[PDB]
Amino acid sequence: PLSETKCTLKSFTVEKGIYQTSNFRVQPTESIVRFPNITNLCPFGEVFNATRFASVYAWNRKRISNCVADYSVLYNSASFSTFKCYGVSPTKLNDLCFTNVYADSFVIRGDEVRQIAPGQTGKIADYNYKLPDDFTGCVIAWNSNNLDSKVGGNYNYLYRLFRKSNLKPFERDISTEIYQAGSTPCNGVEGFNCYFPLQSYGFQPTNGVGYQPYRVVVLSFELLHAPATVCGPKKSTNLVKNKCVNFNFNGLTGTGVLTESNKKFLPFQQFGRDIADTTDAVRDPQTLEILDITPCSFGGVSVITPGTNTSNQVAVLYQGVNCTEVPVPTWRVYSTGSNVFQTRAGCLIGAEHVNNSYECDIPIGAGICASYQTSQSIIAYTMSLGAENSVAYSNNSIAIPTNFTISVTTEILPVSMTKTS
Amino acid sequence: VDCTMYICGDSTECSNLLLQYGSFCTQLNRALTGIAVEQDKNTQEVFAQVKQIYKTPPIKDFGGFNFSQILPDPSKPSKRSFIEDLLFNKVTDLICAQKFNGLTVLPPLLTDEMIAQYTSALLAGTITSGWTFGAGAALQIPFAMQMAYRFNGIGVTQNVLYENQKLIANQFNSAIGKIQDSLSSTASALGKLQDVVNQNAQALNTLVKQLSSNFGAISSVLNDILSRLDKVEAEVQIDRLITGRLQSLQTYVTQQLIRAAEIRASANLAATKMSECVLGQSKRVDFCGKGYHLMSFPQSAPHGVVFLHVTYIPAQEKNFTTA
Amino acid sequence: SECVLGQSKRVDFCGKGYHLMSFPQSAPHGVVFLHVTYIPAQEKNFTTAPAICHDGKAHFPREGVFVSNGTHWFVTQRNFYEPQIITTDNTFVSGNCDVVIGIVNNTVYDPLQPELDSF
Amino acid sequence: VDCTMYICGDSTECSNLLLQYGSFCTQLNRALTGIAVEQDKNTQEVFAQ
Ligand SMILES: *[C@@H]1O[C@H](CO[C@@H]2O[C@@H](C)[C@@H](O)[C@@H](O)[C@@H]2O)[C@@H](O[C@@H]2O[C@H](CO)[C@@H](O)[C@H](O)[C@H]2NC(C)=O)[C@H](O)[C@H]1NC(C)=O
Numbered sequence: 037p038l039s040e041t042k043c044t045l046k047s048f049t050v051e052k053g054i055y056q057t058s059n060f061r062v063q064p065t066e067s068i069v070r071f072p073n074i075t076n077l078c079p080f081g082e083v084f085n086a087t088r089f090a091s092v093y094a095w096n097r098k099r100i101s102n103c104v105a106d107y108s109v110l111y112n113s114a115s116f117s118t119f120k121c122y123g124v125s126p127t128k129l130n131d132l133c134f135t136n137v138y139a140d141s142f143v144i145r146g147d148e149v150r151q152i153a154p155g156q157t158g159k160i161a162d163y164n165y166k167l168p169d170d171f172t173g174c175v176i177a178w179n180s181n182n183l184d185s186k187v188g189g190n191y192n193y194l195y196r197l198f199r200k201s202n203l204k205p206f207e208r209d210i211s212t213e214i215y216q217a218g219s220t221p222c223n224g225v226e227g228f229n230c231y232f233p234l235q236s237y238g239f240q241p242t243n244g245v246g247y248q249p250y251r252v253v254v255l256s257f258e259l260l261h262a263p264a265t266v267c268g269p270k271k272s273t274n275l276v277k278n279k280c281v282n283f284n285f286n287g288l289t290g291t292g293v294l295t296e297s298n299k300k301f302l303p304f305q306q307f308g309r310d311i312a313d314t315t316d317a318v319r320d321p322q323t324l325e326i327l328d329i330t331p332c333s334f335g336g337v338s339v340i341t342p343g344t345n346t347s348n349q350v351a352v353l354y355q356g357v358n359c360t361e362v363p364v365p366t367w368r369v370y371s372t373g374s375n376v377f378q379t380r381a382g383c384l385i386g387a388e389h390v391n392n393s394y395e396c397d398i399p400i401g402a403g404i405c406a407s408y409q410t411s412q413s414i415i416a417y418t419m420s421l422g423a424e425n426s427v428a429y430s431n432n433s434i435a436i437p438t439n440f441t442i443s444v445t446t447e448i449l450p451v452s453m454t455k456t457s
Numbered sequence: 458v459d460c461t462m463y464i465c466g467d468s469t470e471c472s473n474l475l476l477q478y479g480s481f482c483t484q485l486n487r488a489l490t491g492i493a494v495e496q497d498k499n500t501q502e503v504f505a506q507v508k509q510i511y512k513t514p515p516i517k518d519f520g521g522f523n524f525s526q527i528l529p530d531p532s533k534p535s536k537r538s539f540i541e542d543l544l545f546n547k548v549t550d551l552i553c554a555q556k557f558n559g560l561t562v563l564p565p566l567l568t569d570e571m572i573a574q575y576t577s578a579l580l581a582g583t584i585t586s587g588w589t590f591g592a593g594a595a596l597q598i599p600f601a602m603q604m605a606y607r608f609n610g611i612g613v614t615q616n617v618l619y620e621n622q623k624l625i626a627n628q629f630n631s632a633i634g635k636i637q638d639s640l641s642s643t644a645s646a647l648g649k650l651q652d653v654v655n656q657n658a659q660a661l662n663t664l665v666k667q668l669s670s671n672f673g674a675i676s677s678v679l680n681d682i683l684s685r686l687d688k689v690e691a692e693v694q695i696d697r698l699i700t701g702r703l704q705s706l707q708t709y710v711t712q713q714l715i716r717a718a719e720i721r722a723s724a725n726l727a728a729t730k731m732s733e734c735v736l737g738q739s740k741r742v743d744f745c746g747k748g749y750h751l752m753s754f755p756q757s758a759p760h761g762v763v764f765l766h767v768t769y770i771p772a773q774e775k776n777f778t779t780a
Numbered sequence: 781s782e783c784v785l786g787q788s789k790r791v792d793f794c795g796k797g798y799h800l801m802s803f804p805q806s807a808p809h810g811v812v813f814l815h816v817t818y819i820p821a822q823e824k825n826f827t828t829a830p831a832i833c834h835d836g837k838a839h840f841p842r843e844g845v846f847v848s849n850g851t852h853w854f855v856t857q858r859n860f861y862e863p864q865i866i867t868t869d870n871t872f873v874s875g876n877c878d879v880v881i882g883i884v885n886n887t888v889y890d891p892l893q894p895e896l897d898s899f
Numbered sequence: 900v901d902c903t904m905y906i907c908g909d910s911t912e913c914s915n916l917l918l919q920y921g922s923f924c925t926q927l928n929r930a931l932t933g934i935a936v937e938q939d940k941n942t943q944e945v946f947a948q
């Protein structure tokens with residue numbers, strides 16, 4: 037601890053005092069994982085390997101829920117030309133849980149795949165499939181010129197070429213009413229400035245890559261306070277209590293001393309929150325019991341030292357900490373019980389508690405002070421406020437000075453500081 | 458405040474980014490430490506003015522003046538006076554939420570028992586020795602005789618005290634009773650101390666609530682960003698939280714430094730009132746209450762001092778022709 | 781202004797004890813005041829009374845305080861034991877002896893009487 | 900100073916972004932209000948003696 041003071045003071049010599057070096061922390065003993073006990077594998081196969089996809093103007097959506105996923109199978113498939121995730125990392129995606137997942141699928145030109153991203157614009161993004169600005173899913177696309185094109189041209193897939201206004205995020209429009217491009221009404225028939233709003237793609241197998249068909253699948257994941265109906269393949273560990281441990285409840289990851297909670301959670305509630313919005317309590321996804329999440333204890337480590345010009349002995353104060361918590365900072369050789377004293381300021385270690393009282397040499401707090409005294413050791417004591425004195429008052433007695441002393445005393449006051457620019 | 462725990466919590470990933478900002482966390486901890494050390498200095502300079510812990514005699518024959526409401530009550534472990542208990546009960550907020558987020562409250566050096574023992578010694582020296590314990594050794598003098606000296610100090614002949622001693626004693630006892638009754642009844646009297654407690658509680662609640670702000674990041678929960686994004690993308694989101702959280706600490710520490718100056722000025726004033734109103738008799742108009750100052754008695758209060766100023770107010774004036 | 785250019789009655793403003801005078805000394809970015817003060821010492825106990833009852837008159841000190849060495853009564857200044865005989869010149873009369881709590885009986889010398897007696 | 904009008908003026912688009920900074924605008928308004936109230940206290944204690 038003395039070397040830590042020297043280090044934090046950036047000095048090889050330390051004057052008498054109490055120096056707040058570093059913070060103590062109880063580190064986690066082990067890591068807990070608690071995902072839902074769901075065995076049902078998620079049906080991703082039937083959205084990626086479907087024989088025929090939907091037209092992008094009428095993009096299909098399939099809800100994925102109450103199942104266990106394995107996104108590593110998808111990402112490691114290497115069959116996809118584009119695999120872009122927004123707000124979620126592709127590799128970490130398998131180590132997380134989601135409340136619901138929606139798989140959207142459609143076919144578009146290779147040149148249009150760039151429009152399937154948040155904040156995009158263009159015929160597809162504006163009139164066929166719009167992603168929100170704060171999208172949290174993944175966009176996956178691959179060339180399908182082996183399935184969706186034929187000699188003479190495949191016209192199975194349509195897209196909306198004209199619309200009155202841009203689509204809202206995840207909006208779908210299946211209307212076939214003829215678009216009026218001019219002031220003259222169309223009366224339900226095509227003509228000048230009157231065009232059918234859907235146009236068919238011309239997919240020939242010999243067309244350039246920018247004109248070839250591409251199958252697109254968009255996986256939208258939603259994170260909410262609601263229970264996690266979809267989660268990755270991680271196996272849940274056993275549950276331990278009253279010990280500092282890392283935890284991972286339905287993806288909620290943190291560290292604390294999990295304890296049985298008296299909090300009367302209503303049947304719909306899943307989490308409890310702190311003023312800082314950190315999770316304060318949680319419902320176990322398997323046993324449905326409520327657990328408190330108080331953090332593993334921390335406190336300032338103050339090193340009490342006479343000047344190094346006097347001695348290299350030091351005492352250590354773990355501020356606010358109870359002496360039962362200090363383990364036997366990086367160093368731990370101090371914590372043995374030979375000199376340990378629970379002050380109201382915290383656990384004091386390496387100082388000798390004495391019943392005598394003296395002027396406050398080094399202030400510790402709550403009336404406790406420390407000093408280096410005799411065989412020398414660092415003692416800790418309740419400070420003396422002054423010498424006790426009974427004035428000898430009486431209703432008819434007076435004390436009058438028969439002499440005097442002329443005293444000269446020195447008062448020092450700062451007047452200025454160095455002028456800096 | 459552990460600047461690293463407030464900004465980054467448990468995350469080492471965030472802690473490594475916080476190092477890129479350098480000395481800012483050391484500056485914040487150093488500033489808050491200077492403030493904390495000054496609070497002990499402020500208390501010491503106000504209360505530790507008495508050099509010896511004077512005790513009152515067992516026979517309280519003070520000439521009819523009754524100090525029982527202000528002298529220590531031996532029946533209590535706190536050893537506070539009756540009025541000191543009223544003050545403490547009248548003055549004395551998300552403390553557990555604050556604690557869990559890297560914030561901590563350090564105990565003062567002098568306990569309330571020690572501060573009550575200083576006000577006890579200051580009060581005992583005053584009634585048993587007048588102003589003599591302020592200038593040097595405590596010289597006993599009968600209380601009625603030192604009160605006669607107080608009358609001379611305001612330009613009233615000492616015979617006015619001795620001829621009206623029973624009336625003056627009764628007026629004093631009644632006036633002390635009015636203090637006891639007033640502090641027992643109204644809630645607004647100790648507003649100056651409550652305002653300091655409220656301002657500092659509000660500042661901490663504001664600092665904790667800023668942890669819920671996004672500052673443009675995808676989430677305010679720093680553990681979620683690390684659990685949901687890879688390093689190259691996570692560090693961009695974490696740097697937004699670091700920037701806004703660091704700005705929150707700088708705003709908090711700056712306002713605490715300014716509040717510390719206000720408390721410092723008030724503590725300097727209180728130390729001056731202790732020396733000039735309690736350890737002496739002040740000729741300075743309105744410095745020790747309205748009217749001509751006779752004497753003052755200090756009483757301890759939570760994070761403050763209460764001075765009971767005894768003054769002479771002339772009454773029932775008559776007109777006279779003069780030359 | 782108050783400790784160097786004058787004498788301050790303000791307690792503890794210019795050092796401990798009763799302020800006599802102060803001397804300024806310059807220091808780097810600061811000032812050092814040498815405060816000269818009077819500190820009373822070697823106090824002795826004395827019996828005291830608020831007034832002296834003489835010939836039915838209540839006598840009070842003009843300046844000072846009445847003190848007794850155990851057998852005799854004197855008047856002395858409050859901050860330095862310099863006892864003097866209690867006389868009609870260093871005391872003033874106000875009322876009779878019935879109102880003052882703790883008044884003590886003693887003679888009060890009159891310096892005019894021995895002159896007329898001797899003349 | 901209306902912290903929201905100084906920073907964003909009439910814009911609601913900017914006002915929604917300013918909410919991401921949280922309490923900072925309330926802190927600024929609160930500090931300036933404390934100063935303003937103290938100016939009345941300063942005048943009262945000098946003249947209303
Ligand atoms: C002043 O005297 C008191 C004791 O009073 C004694 O009786 C009086 C009638 C008179 O004759 C005094 O001169 C006598 O001395 C002293 O108080 C005692 O001091 C001792 C320590 O020396 C202490 O142990 C006792 O408890 C004190 N007694 C009480 C009742 O408090 C006092 O010290 C004398 N002061 C000076 C300056 O001499």
Ligand SMILES: *[C@@H]1O[C@H](CO)[C@@H](O[C@@H]2O[C@H](CO)[C@@H](O)[C@H](O)[C@H]2NC(C)=O)[C@H](O)[C@H]1NC(C)=O
Nearest residue numbers: 356357358359360361377378379380381382383
């Ligand atoms: C320090 O921690 C220990 C627990 O490790 C506390 O001891 C407990 O105290 C309560 C009373 O408050 C008793 O009911 C328990 O039986 C005690 N437990 C043990 C194992 O002794 C101790 O009180 C704490 N002290 C402080 C100052 O916090």
Ligand SMILES: *[C@@H]1O[C@H](CO)[C@@H](O[C@@H]2O[C@H](CO)[C@@H](O)[C@H](O)[C@H]2NC(C)=O)[C@H](O)[C@H]1NC(C)=O
Nearest residue numbers: 437438439440441442443819820821822823861
């Ligand atoms: C008043 O106190 C002073 C000391 O402050 C006394 O002076 C000393 O007296 C002794 C003899 O008793 C001498 O040996 C010292 O040399 C003197 N010191 C100085 C600085 O002169 C003085 O005698 C005391 N006077 C009375 C009347 O008690």
Ligand SMILES: *[C@@H]1O[C@H](CO)[C@@H](O[C@@H]2O[C@H](CO)[C@@H](O)[C@H](O)[C@H]2NC(C)=O)[C@H](O)[C@H]1NC(C)=O
Nearest residue numbers: 517521522523524525526527539630633634637
């Ligand atoms: C000094 O004042 C106290 C009040 O602080 C007096 O105590 C009261 O005495 C009456 C009886 O005379 C009781 O009915 C009250 O309950 C007492 N109050 C308290 C708070 O104790 C006390 O009598 C006074 N003593 C002298 C000698 O005047």
Ligand SMILES: *[C@@H]1O[C@H](CO)[C@@H](O[C@@H]2O[C@H](CO)[C@@H](O)[C@H](O)[C@H]2NC(C)=O)[C@H](O)[C@H]1NC(C)=O
Nearest residue numbers: 847848849850851852853854855863864865866
């Ligand atoms: C109290 O003071 C008186 C002075 O007025 C002392 O009386 C004198 O004592 C001396 C001897 O020391 C005699 O020579 C004088 O004649 C006395 N004067 C009178 C007027 O009687 C007296 O001794 C002092 N007593 C004490 C106890 O100090």
Ligand SMILES: *[C@@H]1O[C@H](CO)[C@@H](O[C@@H]2O[C@H](CO)[C@@H](O)[C@H](O)[C@H]2NC(C)=O)[C@H](O)[C@H]1NC(C)=O
Nearest residue numbers: 832833834835836837877878882883884885886
């Ligand atoms: C002071 O002296 C007077 C006499 O000069 C004392 O007064 C007498 O007191 C007794 C009772 O003790 C009465 O019976 C007499 O009638 C009083 N005489 C007069 C003229 O009033 C007085 O008691 C003395 N006081 C003290 C404190 O000794």
Ligand SMILES: *[C@@H]1O[C@H](CO)[C@@H](O)[C@H](O)[C@H]1NC(C)=O
Nearest residue numbers: 080081082084085109110113
């Ligand atoms: C599609 O089918 C192939 C086998 O023909 C399989 O390897 C692949 O994993 C399937 N796709 C998905 C998303 O499961």
Ligand SMILES: *[C@@H]1O[C@H](CO)[C@@H](O)[C@H](O)[C@H]1NC(C)=O
Nearest residue numbers: 071072073074321322323324
């Ligand atoms: C998960 O397992 C627990 C036993 O550990 C069981 O009580 C619970 O019913 C299971 N979950 C569901 C949804 O049934």
Ligand SMILES: *[C@@H]1O[C@H](CO)[C@@H](O)[C@H](O)[C@H]1NC(C)=O
Nearest residue numbers: 049050051052343344345346
């Ligand atoms: C350190 O000790 C030396 C004597 O070896 C002394 O000269 C010096 O003043 C001391 N300094 C402090 C700060 O104690």
Ligand SMILES: *[C@@H]1O[C@H](CO)[C@@H](O)[C@H](O)[C@H]1NC(C)=O
Nearest residue numbers: 388389390391392393415416
């Ligand atoms: C200090 O006092 C306690 C009693 O409060 C006693 O048990 C202990 O032995 C004492 N220690 C010393 C060193 O006197």
Ligand SMILES: *[C@@H]1O[C@H](CO)[C@@H](O)[C@H](O)[C@H]1NC(C)=O
Nearest residue numbers: 431432518520599881882883
């Ligand atoms: C002082 O107390 C005594 C009792 O010890 C009493 O007889 C006397 O009258 C009192 N004197 C004064 C001035 O109060």
